[PDB]
Amino acid sequence: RDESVPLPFQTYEQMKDYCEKFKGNPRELASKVSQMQSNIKLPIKHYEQNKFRQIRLPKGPMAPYTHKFLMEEAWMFTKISDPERSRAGEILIDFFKKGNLSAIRPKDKPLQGKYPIHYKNLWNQIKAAIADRTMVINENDHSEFLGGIGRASKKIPEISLTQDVITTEGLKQSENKLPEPRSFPRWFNAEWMWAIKDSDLTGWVPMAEYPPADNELEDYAEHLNKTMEGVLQGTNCAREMGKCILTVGALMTECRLFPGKIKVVPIYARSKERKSMQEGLPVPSEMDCLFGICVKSKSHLNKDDGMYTIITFEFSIREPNLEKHQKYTVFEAGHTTVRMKKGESVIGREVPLYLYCRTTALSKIKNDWLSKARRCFITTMDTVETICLRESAKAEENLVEKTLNEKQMWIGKKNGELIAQPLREALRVQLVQQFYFCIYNDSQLEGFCNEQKKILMALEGDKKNKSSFGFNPEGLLEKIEECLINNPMCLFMAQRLNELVIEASKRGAKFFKT
């Protein structure tokens, strides 16, 4: 205590005396004005910095596909499900193999593949396993693939290492590595526009029954949930949600079921078909479809965080694009038959089938938060529902149904013209945005949004003409720049923020356009 004191006084008793006997004079006005003279900077004016140098964006190779599964180009295999056969959900692929799935084999020479022969052999091990049992028996094969082709590095103790410092061998050094930055993705826009439109299958997401209703509220609540659920179930975004929930849940069970074992987990989503043509028909089709096959490595849990390694194989009808698929290894799988029935002839012939392969890392935390994707619905619901209340509460009337259809939300741009859609279909935009937030979440994304709220608050500051200001906008844009590296969603929302700044500056100018 006696050498801990701050003041020139050493003994604690002197600091005690200066404390107990302290009476401050009004000399902190001159102390504060001299402190003011020492601090010369930070007067701030919006109109001075109103440019914000737009927003800085990284340059380099185009950002790749970071989602654990393929969305737009992914292909489906339809099977009408039995309650007792499909109740397992592991046997689902065993009943799939009795169909045409077993025949498909890739050629040895892939398009755009990094490690062709390995993936081909593993595919044959999956097909051979599915016949007998869904566990792959290869003890040598998984050891190289796991860790993300991570190698187990032998450790030499420090005690014996001193001589190797005296005599330097094995070329002893120390280094760490950093991620390489990427550039704004193109394909992302097409991915959004594909996830926005309704798929032919009715809904992908298990949703429980509705509770009993009393006239007052539960009529309103039940109706709003029926409508919103009805809209969002048909979308392809709901498809990716459903496959994520079902398959990541399957892996989650497989980590307790067979630790330290290799297992073949299907990639699947359940859907019932719905037909609006007529009321009277045989039946609406109830089924489940298969996106692809998946492989799990050792599930052992470290004291520090372990991350499991996973090998994904997906079917696709679509030619791969080297720019966004760089992580994927594509093959030429075969030919798949596709037909339709319409008022026209619509034969359909056949289309070539490609097999996309890759390897990724799944943390147990990611397994959980990605296992429950239903949360997104809620965060959409609230954001939607508030808009209908705040409006209707103004008119003291029921505007909910009228506000949903009539109120126009700005959605996109086409032909250089700002486009808007009603709140019911623009609801899909919010659902897709939250689902991407769930899929694409990185530390980069959270830095981006948490430093982005300041941009938005300054924007609405100029919106009502409140003359808002942030003190070191170069520093703010340096923090926003710092958190943009390889993340596709991060860079996408960055560029879209640029376009928001442009159109807003055109509406009225508190901002800049290059």
Binding site: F95, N100, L201
Partner: peptide, 10 residues
């Protein structure tokens, strides 16, 4: 091409 489910085991 608006054509998703495809393959049927039949």
């Amino acid at each position: 091409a608006a054509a998703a489910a495809a393959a049927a085991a039949a």
